[PDB]
Amino acid sequence: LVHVASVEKGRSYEDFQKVYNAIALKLREDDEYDNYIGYGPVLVRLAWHISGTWDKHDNTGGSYGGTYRFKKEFNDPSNAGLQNGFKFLEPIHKEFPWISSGDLFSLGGVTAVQEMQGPKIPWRCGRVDTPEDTTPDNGRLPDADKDAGYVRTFFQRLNMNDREVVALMGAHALGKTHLKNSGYEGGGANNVFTNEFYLNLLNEDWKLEKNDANNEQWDSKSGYMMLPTDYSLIQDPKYLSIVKEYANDQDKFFKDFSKAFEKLLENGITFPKDAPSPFIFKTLEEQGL
């Protein structure tokens, strides 16, 4: 099963920068959302969830087809809350109706990371919408109640190794959990992309507590939280080494996250040899906008 990237007709860097800019300007405008977190984090989560359905064994799922627009996927219980991201992107899609859905969802994540002062994430266009019957079944995204061996095995389906897993998890510096969406009680939340997830893991005094949904999570008296799967990164000695590395080197974490997140957003896509090179979008700030 082969998905070949096909550039939206006649489009180039400039076109996709305009789309980036529209998303970025909306991120700035719509600042109230989720107790002033803004939409950055949920856009990153959306990009991950539309990509994280991928299965390396048969090339099903993945970002290419834009299948999140279909009810089966949109109503996946693992996607609860992501409707807010989709709503946010709707006016952008209406303004730029030529962009494919998988391009838009993935670009929303790139834009979010960058505007939140994260690393540059090179991004390639050419995802093509596919029909409703190509929508992956629910149950391909990970559970949060498990341990390190679960996390490791899970991410092998996505072709991610230990370093890639630990780097990608660092996105949990962004935003929070919501009891109503996932059964986890939200803790202190940020909308700036840093290596703080790793610092929190290593430096806080964590207590295993039960929340009001009767699920266990790790909390600190300072008001942070970790999912079981987050905490697993300091329980497993291989993950722990990488946690420490990223807690001690912001730049390395940025570089590794950029590579892993691009890879995640690109899994399943075949880029023709004469496809454009990846785009690196300027932030609003870099443009003086």
Relative to beta strand 3-4, strand 269-270 is: parallel
Is 3 flagged in the annotation as binding?
A: no
To the nearest whole angstrom, how small is the minimum distance from the Cβ of residue 204 to ligand HEM?
18
The site for ligand HEM (CB under 6 A) is made up of 41-42, 44-45, 48, 81, 142, 144, 151, 168-169, 171-172, 174-178, 181-182, 184, 227, 229, 261
To the nearest whole angstrom, how small is the minimum distance from the Cβ of residue 183 to ligand HEM?
8
DSSP 8-state class, residue 112 = H
To the nearest whole angstrom, how small is the minimum distance from the Cβ of residue 239 to ligand HEM?
11
Q: Which is nearer to ligand HEM, 181 or 211 (CB)?
A: 181
Q: Which stretches within 204-283 are classed as H helix?
A: 228-235, 237-247, 250-266
Count of residues for the chain? 289
With b for 16 or more beta-carbon neighbours within 10 A and e for fewer, the 242-259 pattern comes to bbebbbeeeeebbebbbb
Is 181 flagged in the annotation as binding?
A: yes
Q: Which residue is nearest to ligand HEM (CB)?
A: 175
Is 48 flagged in the annotation as binding?
A: yes
Q: Which is nearer to ligand HEM, 64 or 184 (CB)?
A: 184
Is 18 flagged in the annotation as binding?
A: no
Strand partners, 225: 219
CA 197 vs CA 5, 118, 170: distances in Å: 34, 13, 6
To the nearest whole angstrom, how small is the minimum distance from the Cβ of residue 133 to ligand HEM?
27
Residues flagged as binding site: 45, 48, 172, 176, 178, 181-182
